[PDB]
Symmetry: D3
Subunit: 88 residues, 6 copies
């Protein structure tokens, strides 16, 4: 059933730069579950877990071709909890 999650919206130079793979790899390292996608208004990252370490490291380790201009966060409800972290 449902659980509280977090959606992060990351905007900047975040496409064509290895950003979705970067997010994926960071989520793997952090043992996070959810997904990442590029929906045309930046990159959306949905997580089951608290996003703080992820956010710290998103910024600090941003790929060299990428550039993060802003990150927004909001809560949402998972309909079913994720068991993996996937690129969608």
């Amino acid at each position: 059933n449902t659980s509280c999650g977090v959606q992060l919206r990351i905007r900047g130079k975040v496409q064509g730069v290895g950003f979705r793979p970067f997010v994926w790899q960071l989520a793997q390292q952090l043992n996070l579950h959810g997904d990442v996608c590029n929906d045309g208004d930046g990159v959306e990252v949905r997580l089951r877990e608290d996003p703080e370490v992820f956010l710290v490291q998103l910024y600090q380790h941003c790929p060299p071709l990428a550039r993060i201009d802003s990150v927004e966060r909001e809560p949402f409800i998972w309909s079913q909890l994720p068991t993996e972290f996937t690129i969608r």
Copy 2:
């Protein structure tokens, strides 16, 4: 804007027994925000804060005429955060 909340659904003998006032008073004592209502399928309590102490004390201090048969919890998203605890 939005925040993660918790909805509790309390079923049993929970109407005509001072249950909504009891919930209100417990929320006041605990400095909780949200609301309580009876919507015909028990009592729904919506909280901004984590419900655990509230739940402990709901059970332990249940009014004498009342009887709690079950409590369910689920997350939801507040559209605007509550600044009081109110009976609705």
Copy 3:
């Protein structure tokens, strides 16, 4: 990879009484993941999530033939996170 979990050790009259199914059903209602077993020194419940609501309700809704004499908790590390709640 690994995550912080909680092991609960529940002792009393907790076998032959529907206790493992009771735990399972409570974990389902609470959307918890991990497992339950009877290993000869009571019932061990391992959870991914914080156990507090589970504990409240374990006590309050204890099956009628069962009797809980004590519950102990300790942290441990999951080797892989659970995706279900199962009876083992």
Copy 4:
């Protein structure tokens, strides 16, 4: 330096009944730090850690001569964090 703590005020039949030792033993089992005292308006328990499991078990395992009528909680600031749990 300072940290956020919780003070619990437990009222009822809570003196002459083994209540301070009971609290101590529960805190030991739960690996909690802080202190307990009887200051003439019930028993005050100060904890470094979140009090929820403690509270659950305070109620469920209340000594037979004791009787808990109410428990109140409030936050406070530790001037120095406790390294033990002690009866004061």
Copy 5:
């Protein structure tokens, strides 16, 4: 009544630079409550909520004329919880 809060003390080039408005805007984006002021030893930010995302973004998005040299955090107790985020 009272709740646990966090006070952040931000020092550097943090006056005459749009820092209080920057903090305000960040708190709005994050749905945080409390206040900000310049009391002559940097900027003090008092929050109801956990400060971690705020801190991440304080640093990453520091206005161009500003410069953050240090940030300290300590807990404190709110006398009444804030319902807005305001510049004081």
Copy 6:
């Protein structure tokens, strides 16, 4: 007894640069407990408390001769909780 902790593994130019003292001083400022060591594969920091603010500030305030290339985190269990923060 045991508690959930966090181990951080910090790699880069992190030896001969005042890194262990830097970590120590940051832990003191943050009122953290645990330890730091250099075990030949970077710097390991073990903490009792949640590491997020520590991590934010590790990166932002990295000493000038140092360079942080990566930070990994994993949970572990303390055998006895630390009462100080020490360089080992």
